[PDB]
């Protein structure tokens, strides 16, 4: 509702996330291999339905 200077949305904060530790904890707790899924989610959140 109040985007910062020269930014359309807060999707740029996703690049600070450490997806590797999140994938490791997901694999430990739930036995899910989701390392590529976090990257796909990040790319889709940064730009919804790009032209691939």
């Amino acid at each position: 509702r109040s985007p910062p200077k020269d930014e359309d949305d807060l999707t740029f904060k996703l690049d600070e996330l450490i997806l590797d530790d999140y994938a490791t904890e997901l694999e430990r707790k739930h036995q899910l291999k989701k390392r590529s899924t976090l990257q796909i989610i990040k790319e889709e959140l940064q730009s919804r339905y790009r032209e691939i």
Binding site: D15, E16, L17, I18, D21, Y22, E25
Partner: protein, 99 residues
Amino acid sequence: LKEIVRLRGYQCVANILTMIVLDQEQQQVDVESFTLSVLDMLESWPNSSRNRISSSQIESVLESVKTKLKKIQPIGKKINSLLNSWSKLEISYKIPKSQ
């Protein structure tokens, strides 16, 4: 209260404690009444994570003041209950961020 937490009210309450019950410009009985009047809302506010306290480290001030006024046992027991309640908190799993 959530807004005060966002404003880091605990940080201000740490200095408010320190000036009165560490620096001594007043009387011990009145300072004891003040401490009993200021522990209550700290006990009452909604809390879900020690990240809130970590922005103030008010627990350290609480340890210092329970150690200084160790003779006043109600204050000590209330601070015991308060740190016991606060120590149960955590943040489940929180994704680390790049630094």
